[PDB]
Amino acid sequence: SHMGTIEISSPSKTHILAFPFPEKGHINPMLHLCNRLASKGFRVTLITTISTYKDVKNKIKCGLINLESIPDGTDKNLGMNGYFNQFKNSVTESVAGIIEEYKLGHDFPPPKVLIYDSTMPWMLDVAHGHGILGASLFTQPCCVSVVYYHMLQGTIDFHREQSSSSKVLLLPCLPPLEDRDLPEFDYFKEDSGFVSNLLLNQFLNIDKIDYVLFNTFEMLESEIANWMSNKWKILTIGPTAPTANYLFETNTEVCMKWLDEREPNSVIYVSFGSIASLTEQQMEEISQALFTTNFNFLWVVREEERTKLPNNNNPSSESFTTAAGKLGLIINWCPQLDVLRHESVACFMTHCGWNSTLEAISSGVPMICVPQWVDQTTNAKFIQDVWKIGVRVNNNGGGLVKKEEIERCIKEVCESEKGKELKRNAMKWKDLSKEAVSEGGSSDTNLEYFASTLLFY
Numbered sequence: 001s002h003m004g005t006i007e008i009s010s011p012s013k014t015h016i017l018a019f020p021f022p023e024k025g026h027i028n029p030m031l032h033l034c035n036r037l038a039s040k041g042f043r044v045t046l047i048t049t050i051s052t053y054k055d056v057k058n059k060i061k062c063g064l065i066n067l068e069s070i071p072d073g074t075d076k077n078l079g080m081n082g083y084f085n086q087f088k089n090s091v092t093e094s095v096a097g098i099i100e101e102y103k104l105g106h107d108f109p110p111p112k113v114l115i116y117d118s119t120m121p122w123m124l125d126v127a128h129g130h131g132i133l134g135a136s137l138f139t140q141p142c143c144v145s146v147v148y149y150h151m152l153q154g155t156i157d158f159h160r161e162q163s164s165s166s167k168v169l170l171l172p173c174l175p176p177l178e179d180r181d182l183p184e185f186d187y188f189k190e191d192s193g194f195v196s197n198l199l200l201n202q203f204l205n206i207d208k209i210d211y212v213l214f215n216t217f218e219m220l221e222s223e224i225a226n227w228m229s230n231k232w233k234i235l236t237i238g239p240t241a242p243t244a245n246y247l248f249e250t251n252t253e254v255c256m257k258w259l260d261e262r263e264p265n266s267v268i269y270v271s272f273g274s275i276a277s278l279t280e281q282q283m284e285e286i287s288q289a290l291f292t293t294n295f296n297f298l299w300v301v302r303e304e305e306r307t308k309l310p311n312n313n314n315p316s317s318e319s320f321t322t323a324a325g326k327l328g329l330i331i332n333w334c335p336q337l338d339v340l341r342h343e344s345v346a347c348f349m350t351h352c353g354w355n356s357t358l359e360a361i362s363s364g365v366p367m368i369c370v371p372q373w374v375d376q377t378t379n380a381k382f383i384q385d386v387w388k389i390g391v392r393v394n395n396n397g398g399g400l401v402k403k404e405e406i407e408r409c410i411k412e413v414c415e416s417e418k419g420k421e422l423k424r425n426a427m428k429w430k431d432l433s434k435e436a437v438s439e440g441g442s443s444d445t446n447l448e449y450f451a452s453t454l455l456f457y
């Protein structure tokens with residue numbers, strides 16, 4: 001006869017903590033990843049600052065994710081330094097308290113891993129200091145991330161005096177990068193060094209991270225992902241957003257109704273993300289282009305940005321018939337993924353934030369690139385010249401993008417034979433995007449590696 005005990009380690013008895021930096025471009029890929037992990041059966045606790053808790057609570061539906069709030073640690077009114085140092089002190093202690101709370105509880109399994117935003121690398125020390133694994137979630141592509149790595153290593157001169165000559169930078173497994181293709185820190189002026197260090201320091205403890213996760217897929221970034229694979233065991237697990245236990249954004253019904261009433265491939269979707277704020281002159285140039293183009297438009301203009309519009313109680317939305325006989329809608333926020341996947345959307349005029357770029361890739365929507373800072377410039381270079389799914393506008397070579405140049409790009413993407421090829425390329429990358437996260441695809445495999453190895457004794 002036999003006698004003894006069997007212990008089973010399963011996703012249902014495995015507790016994943018996740019902690020995004022409180023900006024939408026960081027929260028959203030983290031949330032999507034939490035949804036996929038919950039679907040595999042894991043217990044998942046999303047930790048987020050109290051000021052983003054409401055936004056996140058309104059978005060998550062059907063249940064599977066356990067939500068915890070922590071203090072903001074900031075007030076958003078101070079300058080970047082201080083807003084950040086207080087921030088790091090505050091969330092270290094509060095996440096540490098959550099970790100210990102769940103180690104001692106009985107409703108949940110003890111935490112086995114903390115998934116933390118890659119720009120908060122000190123959270124690896126919190127995870128290890130409490131005896132649990134640390135997964136660093138990068139929310140930018142491999143290609144721009146490697147540029148930060150090379151910048152941190154201080155081997156090549158990244159200083160730019162662009163006024164006396166033009167520089168082109170060659171890094172391994174990357175295309176030649178002109179000066180305008182480098183991640184853009186000069187916009188931030190005296191805080192350029194601080195923003196820079198934030199992104200560079202993602203790599204301070206790369207050798208010690210238990211899981212390095214990238215919201216990208218291998219085929220999209222083949223050469224550079226492999227390069228990174230040979231140095232670190234990175235796991236490309238993207239897109240974390242679902243293909244065509246979910247996220248519900250506001251104004252979903254409004255935008256879907258409006259788009260349903262347009263013709264297929266008739267709408268330019270315009271958004272500059274959750275953070276960027278364009279000058280009122282830049283808003284003017286974009287306005288006049290969209291009001292004279294041969295297409296309908298849906299333009300997200302955030303509430304705080306309505307004052308920058310050309311034009312006492314800023315409307316939450318505004319409906320238009322344009323000078324070319326088309327229809328426009330300005331709205332404070334939309335379900336961007338549903339919008340990009342709508343048959344009416346012909347192209348995406350974007351600031352080229354990474355989530356916007358990859359959502360567009362996963363939706364097969366070609367792009368007009370109007371990058372503003374950090375990784376957006378590098379993303380635009382890859383969108384136009386590598387993936388060939390969009391066109392980048394030309395600034396005085398920070399410079400204003402004039403309506404005529406915006407119109408140029410709209411006509412190329414939306415009217416020309418070249419535009420038809422960009423669309424074909426975008427549908428191709430969308431299929432590869434789907435294959436990566438389907439069973440046996442590179443991202444499904446890499447995410448299963450993370451999930452399966454979490455169970456090991």
Ligand SMILES: O=c1ccn([C@@H]2O[C@H](COP(=O)(O)OP(=O)(O)O)[C@@H](O)[C@H]2O)c(=O)[nH]1
Nearest residue numbers: 025028273274300333334336353354355356
């Ligand atoms: O009307 C909008 C505009 C943006 N987004 C989402 O907000 C995120 C923007 O992140 P991104 O990386 O593109 O740029 P960031 O906002 O960080 O500059 C993306 O997940 C978008 O889908 C949205 O849900 N509704």
